[PDB]
Design a protein around this ligand. Structure first.
Ligand SMILES: O=C1NS(=O)(=O)CCOCCCCCCN2C[C@@]3(CCc4cc(Cl)ccc43)COc3ccc1cc32
Length: 151
Protein backbone atom coordinates (compact mmCIF):
# COMPACT_ATOMS: atom_id res chain seq x y z
CA UNK A 1 0.00 0.00 0.00
CA UNK A 2 2.22 2.92 1.20
CA UNK A 3 5.21 0.78 2.27
CA UNK A 4 7.48 3.80 2.73
CA UNK A 5 5.12 5.41 5.23
CA UNK A 6 4.53 2.16 7.13
CA UNK A 7 8.22 1.32 7.40
CA UNK A 8 8.99 4.89 8.46
CA UNK A 9 6.35 4.79 11.18
CA UNK A 10 7.62 1.51 12.58
CA UNK A 11 11.22 2.73 12.63
CA UNK A 12 10.47 6.14 14.12
CA UNK A 13 7.91 4.79 16.57
CA UNK A 14 10.24 2.06 17.85
CA UNK A 15 13.15 4.47 18.32
CA UNK A 16 11.10 7.04 20.25
CA UNK A 17 9.54 4.43 22.55
CA UNK A 18 12.87 2.68 23.14
CA UNK A 19 14.42 6.05 23.97
CA UNK A 20 11.61 6.93 26.38
CA UNK A 21 11.36 3.56 28.15
CA UNK A 22 14.98 2.54 27.83
CA UNK A 23 13.91 -0.96 26.81
CA UNK A 24 14.10 -2.77 23.47
CA UNK A 25 10.89 -3.91 21.77
CA UNK A 26 11.46 -7.56 20.91
CA UNK A 27 8.47 -7.84 18.52
CA UNK A 28 9.36 -8.77 14.94
CA UNK A 29 9.53 -5.88 12.51
CA UNK A 30 6.91 -5.93 9.79
CA UNK A 31 7.70 -6.00 6.11
CA UNK A 32 11.35 -5.26 5.21
CA UNK A 33 12.36 -6.24 8.72
CA UNK A 34 16.06 -6.67 7.97
CA UNK A 35 16.25 -3.08 6.74
CA UNK A 36 14.17 -1.61 9.59
CA UNK A 37 16.34 -3.43 12.11
CA UNK A 38 19.51 -2.02 10.55
CA UNK A 39 17.83 1.37 10.45
CA UNK A 40 17.07 1.20 14.17
CA UNK A 41 20.72 0.09 14.83
CA UNK A 42 21.80 3.12 12.90
CA UNK A 43 19.51 5.52 14.79
CA UNK A 44 20.80 4.13 18.10
CA UNK A 45 24.28 4.92 16.86
CA UNK A 46 23.94 8.35 15.23
CA UNK A 47 20.72 9.54 16.84
CA UNK A 48 21.96 9.14 20.40
CA UNK A 49 25.08 11.10 19.50
CA UNK A 50 23.17 14.03 18.03
CA UNK A 51 21.19 14.49 21.24
CA UNK A 52 24.50 14.80 23.10
CA UNK A 53 26.47 16.85 20.56
CA UNK A 54 23.64 19.42 20.53
CA UNK A 55 22.70 19.11 24.19
CA UNK A 56 22.50 22.86 24.76
CA UNK A 57 20.54 23.65 21.56
CA UNK A 58 18.23 20.69 22.16
CA UNK A 59 17.32 21.64 25.71
CA UNK A 60 17.03 25.26 24.45
CA UNK A 61 14.49 24.30 21.79
CA UNK A 62 12.62 22.02 24.20
CA UNK A 63 12.22 24.88 26.66
CA UNK A 64 11.05 27.23 23.87
CA UNK A 65 8.36 24.72 22.91
CA UNK A 66 7.04 24.41 26.50
CA UNK A 67 5.34 21.04 26.09
CA UNK A 68 2.91 20.35 28.92
CA UNK A 69 -0.11 18.60 27.40
CA UNK A 70 -1.72 17.05 24.32
CA UNK A 71 -2.47 20.39 22.66
CA UNK A 72 1.19 21.41 22.84
CA UNK A 73 2.12 18.11 21.25
CA UNK A 74 -0.34 18.72 18.45
CA UNK A 75 1.26 22.13 17.86
CA UNK A 76 4.63 20.48 17.12
CA UNK A 77 3.78 19.51 13.53
CA UNK A 78 3.67 23.17 12.52
CA UNK A 79 7.11 23.76 14.04
CA UNK A 80 8.50 20.66 12.32
CA UNK A 81 7.36 21.80 8.92
CA UNK A 82 8.70 25.27 9.65
CA UNK A 83 12.15 24.15 10.84
CA UNK A 84 12.73 20.78 9.12
CA UNK A 85 10.77 20.84 5.86
CA UNK A 86 11.67 24.39 4.85
CA UNK A 87 15.36 23.73 4.22
CA UNK A 88 17.63 21.69 1.94
CA UNK A 89 17.20 18.03 2.78
CA UNK A 90 20.01 15.68 3.79
CA UNK A 91 20.24 12.62 6.04
CA UNK A 92 21.74 14.68 8.85
CA UNK A 93 18.69 16.94 9.10
CA UNK A 94 16.48 13.84 9.02
CA UNK A 95 18.45 12.34 11.90
CA UNK A 96 18.05 15.58 13.82
CA UNK A 97 14.30 15.57 13.08
CA UNK A 98 13.99 12.07 14.52
CA UNK A 99 16.53 12.62 17.31
CA UNK A 100 14.89 15.73 18.68
CA UNK A 101 11.72 13.67 18.42
CA UNK A 102 13.24 11.10 20.79
CA UNK A 103 14.39 13.96 23.02
CA UNK A 104 10.77 15.13 23.18
CA UNK A 105 9.62 11.55 23.76
CA UNK A 106 11.81 11.22 26.86
CA UNK A 107 10.46 14.57 28.02
CA UNK A 108 6.87 13.41 27.58
CA UNK A 109 7.69 10.42 29.86
CA UNK A 110 9.21 12.69 32.54
CA UNK A 111 6.04 14.76 32.68
CA UNK A 112 3.92 11.59 32.68
CA UNK A 113 2.42 12.10 29.22
CA UNK A 114 3.72 8.82 27.79
CA UNK A 115 0.51 8.30 25.83
CA UNK A 116 1.51 11.20 23.55
CA UNK A 117 4.57 9.34 22.28
CA UNK A 118 2.99 7.22 19.55
CA UNK A 119 0.87 10.16 18.35
CA UNK A 120 4.10 12.18 18.19
CA UNK A 121 5.89 9.47 16.20
CA UNK A 122 2.97 9.61 13.76
CA UNK A 123 3.24 13.38 13.39
CA UNK A 124 6.97 13.16 12.73
CA UNK A 125 6.49 10.37 10.20
CA UNK A 126 3.80 12.47 8.54
CA UNK A 127 6.18 15.41 8.21
CA UNK A 128 9.11 13.32 7.00
CA UNK A 129 7.29 11.19 4.44
CA UNK A 130 4.54 13.49 3.23
CA UNK A 131 6.81 16.51 2.68
CA UNK A 132 10.00 14.74 1.55
CA UNK A 133 8.85 11.60 -0.31
CA UNK A 134 10.59 12.51 -3.55
CA UNK A 135 13.95 13.07 -1.85
CA UNK A 136 13.57 9.88 0.21
CA UNK A 137 12.81 7.82 -2.89
CA UNK A 138 15.69 9.32 -4.85
CA UNK A 139 18.01 8.52 -1.94
CA UNK A 140 16.84 4.88 -1.79
CA UNK A 141 14.65 5.23 1.28
CA UNK A 142 15.70 3.34 4.38
CA UNK A 143 18.03 1.05 2.46
CA UNK A 144 19.73 4.29 1.45
CA UNK A 145 19.73 5.48 5.06
CA UNK A 146 21.54 2.34 6.24
CA UNK A 147 24.10 2.52 3.43
CA UNK A 148 24.72 6.20 4.10
CA UNK A 149 25.76 5.55 7.70
CA UNK A 150 27.40 2.13 7.14
CA UNK A 151 30.61 1.73 9.18
O1 LIG B 1 19.29 21.15 11.18
C1 LIG B 1 18.52 21.63 12.03
N1 LIG B 1 18.74 22.83 12.62
S1 LIG B 1 20.23 23.50 12.26
O2 LIG B 1 20.10 23.72 10.79
O3 LIG B 1 20.42 24.62 13.20
C2 LIG B 1 21.39 22.18 12.58
C3 LIG B 1 21.78 22.35 14.03
O4 LIG B 1 20.73 22.38 14.97
C4 LIG B 1 21.10 22.07 16.25
C5 LIG B 1 19.85 21.89 17.11
C6 LIG B 1 18.78 22.91 16.85
C7 LIG B 1 17.39 22.76 17.48
C8 LIG B 1 16.53 21.63 16.93
C9 LIG B 1 15.36 22.12 16.01
N2 LIG B 1 14.89 20.98 15.19
C10 LIG B 1 13.84 20.12 15.77
C11 LIG B 1 12.50 20.10 15.02
C12 LIG B 1 11.75 21.42 15.38
C13 LIG B 1 10.81 21.12 16.59
C14 LIG B 1 10.68 19.63 16.51
C15 LIG B 1 9.76 18.84 17.20
C16 LIG B 1 9.81 17.44 16.98
CL1 LIG B 1 8.76 16.39 17.90
C17 LIG B 1 10.72 16.83 16.09
C18 LIG B 1 11.63 17.67 15.41
C19 LIG B 1 11.61 19.06 15.63
C20 LIG B 1 12.74 19.87 13.49
O5 LIG B 1 13.80 18.94 13.31
C21 LIG B 1 14.99 19.63 13.12
C22 LIG B 1 15.68 19.25 11.94
C23 LIG B 1 16.85 19.92 11.61
C24 LIG B 1 17.33 20.95 12.42
C25 LIG B 1 16.67 21.34 13.59
C26 LIG B 1 15.48 20.68 13.97
Amino acid sequence: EDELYRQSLEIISRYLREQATGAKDTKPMGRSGATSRKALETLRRVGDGVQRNHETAFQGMLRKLDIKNEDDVKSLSRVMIHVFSDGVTNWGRIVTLISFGAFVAKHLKTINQESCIEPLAESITDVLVRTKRDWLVKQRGWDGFVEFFHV
